[PDB]
Amino acid sequence: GGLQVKNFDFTVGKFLTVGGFINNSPQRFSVNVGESMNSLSLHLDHRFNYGADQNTIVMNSTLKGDNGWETEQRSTNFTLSAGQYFEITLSYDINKFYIDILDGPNLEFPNRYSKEFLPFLSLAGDARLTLVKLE
Amino acid sequence: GGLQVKNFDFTVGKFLTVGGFINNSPQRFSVNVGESMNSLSLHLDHRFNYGADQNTIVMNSTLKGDNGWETEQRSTNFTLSAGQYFEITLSYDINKFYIDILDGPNLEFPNRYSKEFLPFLSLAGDARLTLVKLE
Numbered sequence: 432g433g434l435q436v437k438n439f440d441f442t443v444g445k446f447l448t449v450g451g452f453i454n455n456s457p458q459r460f461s462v463n464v465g466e467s468m469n470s471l472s473l474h475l476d477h478r479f480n481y482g483a484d485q486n487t488i489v490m491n492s493t494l495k496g497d498n499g500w501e502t503e504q505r506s507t508n509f510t511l512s513a514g515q516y517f518e519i520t521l522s523y524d525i526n527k528f529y530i531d532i533l534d535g536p537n538l539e540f541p542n543r544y545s546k547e548f549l550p551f552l553s554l555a556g557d558a559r560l561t562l563v564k565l566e
Numbered sequence: 567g568g569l570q571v572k573n574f575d576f577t578v579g580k581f582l583t584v585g586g587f588i589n590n591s592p593q594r595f596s597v598n599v600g601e602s603m604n605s606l607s608l609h610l611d612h613r614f615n616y617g618a619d620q621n622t623i624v625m626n627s628t629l630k631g632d633n634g635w636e637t638e639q640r641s642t643n644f645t646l647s648a649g650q651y652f653e654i655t656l657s658y659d660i661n662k663f664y665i666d667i668l669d670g671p672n673l674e675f676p677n678r679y680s681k682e683f684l685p686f687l688s689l690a691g692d693a694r695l696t697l698v699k700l701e
C-alpha cells in the first residue's frame with residue numbers, strides 16, 4: 432500500500448511539495464515525514480475544529496508512534512480552509528525543517544533526529560493527498 | 567532511495583500522472599511501473615535519437631529486468647520534444663493499460679501479468695521526474 436517513487440530522494444536541500452484537498456467539515460489533517468508511520472521527524476497537524484484547538488497548527492515528532500509524541504510547537508497563524516486545495520512545501524537541513532505553506536506562513540521546526548534523508552511520507556486525517564512534487 | 571508515498575495506491579481505476587522535464591539532447595527516457603526495477607508491467611520508452619529508432623515509442627514489460635524484455639509494441643505517433651515539460655497519465659484494468667500523453671496520443675498496452683495493484687514507479691533515462699499525481 433503506497434507507491435514507491437524511486438526517483439524522489441528527499442535529502443537536504445530538496446523541496447518536497449504536497450498538494451491535495453481538505454475535506455469539508457474537517458477536524459484536522461497532518462502531513463507526516465520520517466522513516467515510517469511510527470518514526471516521524473515532522474508531524475504537521477492543521478487542527479480546524481478539534482475541541483479546544485480551533486485553527487491551530489501543531490508540530491511535533493515521535494520515535495514511538497502515538498506513544499512517543501514529544502514537545503509540541505504550536506502556531507495560530509492559520510490560513511487553510513475546509514474544502515480547499517492546499518500546497519505545503521518542506522525542505523530541511525541538519526538543524527531545521529522549513530515549512531512553506533502556500534499563501535500562508537513560513538514556519539521552522541527542529542530537525543530533532545539529525546536526519547539527512549527521509550524515506551516516508553503520509554497524509555493523515557481529513558484531507559486527500561493528490562500531488563507530490565520534488566525539486 | 568526513493569520516497570514511499572503511503573497514500574497513493576495505484577489500483578485499478580485510479581489515474582496516475584507523472585510530470586517532469588525531458589533533458590536537452592536526449593537519447594530516450596522511460597516511465598516504468600511494476601513491482602520493482604526488475605519486474606515491470608509497463609516500460610514506456612520515448613526514443614528520440616536512439617540509433618535506428620528516431621522518435622519512436624516502445625512499450626514492453628519484463629519479469630527478469632534487462633534479460634526478460636518481451637514483445638515490443640511500437641508507435642511513431644510521437645509528440646514529445648527535447649527540453650520540454652511532459653505529463654503522462656496511466657490507468658489500467660485487469661486487461662489493459664491506458665496511456666494518455668498530454669497533448670499527444672492515447673495508447674493501450676496489455677496488462678500481461680493481470681496486476682490489480684502496482685507498488686513501484688521509476689523514470690529512467692534522459693529526463694527528470696518532478697511530479698506524481700494520483701486521482
Ligand SMILES: OC[C@H]1O[C@@H](O[C@H]2[C@H](O)[C@@H](O)[C@H](O)O[C@@H]2CO)[C@H](O)[C@@H](O)[C@H]1O
Pocket residue numbers: 474476489490491500501503
Ligand atoms: O503532538 C501531536 C499529537 O498530538 C496529540 O494530541 C496531544 C494534544 O495536542 C496535547 O494538547 C495533549 O497534551 O496531548 C495529546 C496527546 O499527545 C494527537 O492525539 C496526535 O494525533 C498528534 O497530533
Ligand SMILES: OC[C@H]1O[C@@H](O[C@H]2[C@H](O)[C@@H](O)[C@H](O)O[C@@H]2CO)[C@H](O)[C@@H](O)[C@H]1O
Pocket residue numbers: 609611624625626635636638
Ligand atoms: O523493449 C524495451 C527494451 O528495449 C531494449 O532494446 C531492444 C530493442 O528495442 C530491440 O529492437 C532489439 O531487438 O532488442 C533490444 C534489447 O532487448 C532496450 O535496451 C531496453 O532498455 C528497453 O528499452
